Design a protein around this ligand. Structure first.
Ligand SMILES: *[C@@H]1O[C@H](CO[C@@H]2O[C@@H](C)[C@@H](O)[C@@H](O)[C@@H]2O)[C@@H](O[C@@H]2O[C@H](CO)[C@@H](O[C@@H]3O[C@H](CO)[C@@H](O)[C@H](O[C@H]4O[C@H](CO)[C@@H](O)[C@H](O)[C@@H]4O)[C@@H]3O)[C@H](O)[C@H]2NC(C)=O)[C@H](O)[C@H]1NC(C)=O
Ligand SMILES: *[C@@H]1O[C@H](CO)[C@@H](O[C@@H]2O[C@H](CO)[C@@H](O[C@@H]3O[C@H](CO)[C@@H](O)[C@H](O)[C@@H]3O)[C@H](O)[C@H]2NC(C)=O)[C@H](O)[C@H]1NC(C)=O
Ligand SMILES: *[C@@H]1O[C@H](CO)[C@@H](O[C@@H]2O[C@H](CO)[C@@H](O[C@@H]3O[C@H](CO)[C@@H](O)[C@H](O)[C@@H]3O)[C@H](O)[C@H]2NC(C)=O)[C@H](O)[C@H]1NC(C)=O
Ligand SMILES: *[C@@H]1O[C@H](CO)[C@@H](O[C@@H]2O[C@H](CO)[C@@H](O[C@@H]3O[C@H](CO)[C@@H](O)[C@H](O)[C@@H]3O)[C@H](O)[C@H]2NC(C)=O)[C@H](O)[C@H]1NC(C)=O
Ligand SMILES: *[C@@H]1O[C@H](CO)[C@@H](O[C@@H]2O[C@H](CO)[C@@H](O[C@@H]3O[C@H](CO)[C@@H](O)[C@H](O)[C@@H]3O)[C@H](O)[C@H]2NC(C)=O)[C@H](O)[C@H]1NC(C)=O
Ligand SMILES: *[C@@H]1O[C@H](CO)[C@@H](O[C@@H]2O[C@H](CO)[C@@H](O)[C@H](O)[C@H]2NC(C)=O)[C@H](O)[C@H]1NC(C)=O
Lengths: 71, 48, 22
């Protein structure tokens, strides 16, 4: 899973992988990394339960649009 | 199950269990949150 | 549909948009 803001994100359909520096989410039968966003994942619980969770940032697709909207 | 189709691909057993749980229609967060209980139940069943 | 029921469905984007505007 991924720790973003104190919440545990799990992939909707796929697995989290790391190429050494960055984290992506990809389907389980063909490597095509995708940026980890709220659409690829779903939240469940907090960071204190899962074993092996890792820190990372989860991009929010609505955030850039909201920023332009604010501007 | 990968070794049943082609070259065996390593994967942590917890992740494999999440895959199986998703296969039986249960969200993998259930396992990732109850892993200790599932492991204890499996060990107890094997002992029995 | 037979058996449907009143209830409210909360839209996640609604609080974000309304909070931005307010
Ligand atoms: C692990 O993965 C990350 C992500 O990069 C992606 O995966 C890599 C494995 C590799 O295939 C990349 O081609 C692929 O995009 C690697 O980290 C770097 O990420 C940046 C941006 O994604 C890539 O961009 C490259 O390096 C510069 C980044 O600014 C720039 O010269 C080029 O990017 C162009 O486009 C970006 C878009 O944001 C723009 O900002 C730039 O200014 C520029 O126009 C260039 O394409 C890098 O390829 C990735 N690698 C490096 C060294 O920067 C990471 O390297 C990779 N590590 C390993 C061991 O695989
Ligand atoms: C993912 O990120 C969170 C937040 O960084 C990690 O949780 C840990 O939270 C504490 C406090 O928010 C961070 O500092 C802590 O301070 C207390 C003060 O008493 C100290 O006792 C702790 O030892 C800790 O230093 C802490 O940086 C942070 N830990 C990490 C590794 O980031 C959470 O651990 C991260 N998830 C992982 C590593 O799986
Ligand atoms: C879901 O059902 C299972 C039944 O298989 C429950 O698992 C076990 O439930 C017992 C009841 O408490 C737990 O006993 C434990 O005893 C030890 C003694 O030291 C202590 O850690 C606690 O007092 C604890 O109660 C046991 O931990 C637990 N797991 C096992 C046996 O592997 C489970 O409690 C149920 N979960 C629910 C209803 O949320
Ligand atoms: C299962 O659900 C449906 C609701 O979609 C029930 O339809 C029944 O239709 C009658 C109208 O004739 C509804 O009005 C009430 O009927 C009862 C008799 O069940 C009558 O005594 C009242 O004075 C009133 O007219 C009724 O709300 C509704 N019945 C129920 C239980 O919801 C259908 O009957 C239901 N079947 C069972 C076994 O629950
Ligand atoms: C879910 O909620 C809506 C709103 O109550 C229900 O639609 C129906 O809407 C009418 C008017 O808003 C409610 O009164 C009705 O007015 C008409 C026109 O005057 C009249 O001919 C009817 O006899 C009735 O008095 C009506 O109460 C309301 N129906 C219900 C059950 O609340 C809709 O039916 C609700 N659906 C379910 C499954 O509860
Ligand atoms: C898998 O095992 C390794 C090794 O135990 C873990 O990495 C850490 O490595 C140091 C030294 O080898 C140990 O002292 C730590 O206990 C290890 N941390 C943990 C949590 O075990 C690695 O983290 C383990 N991965 C998972 C998901 O448990």
């Amino acid at each position: 899973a991924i720790c973003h803001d104190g919440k545990a994100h799990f992939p909707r359909e796929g697995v989290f992988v790391s190429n050494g520096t960055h984290w992506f989410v990809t389907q389980r039968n063909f490597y095509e990394p995708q940026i980890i966003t709220t659409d690829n994942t779903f939240v469940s619980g907090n960071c204190d339960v899962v074993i092996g969770i890792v820190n990372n940032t989860v991009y929010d697709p609505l955030q850039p649009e909201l920023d332009s909207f604010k501007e | 199950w990968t070794f049943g189709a082609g070259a065996a691909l390593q994967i942590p057993f917890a992740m494999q269990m999440a895959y199986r749980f998703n296969g039986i229609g249960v969200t993998q967060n259930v396992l990732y949150e109850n892993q200790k209980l599932i492991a204890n139940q499996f060990n107890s069943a094997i002992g029995k």
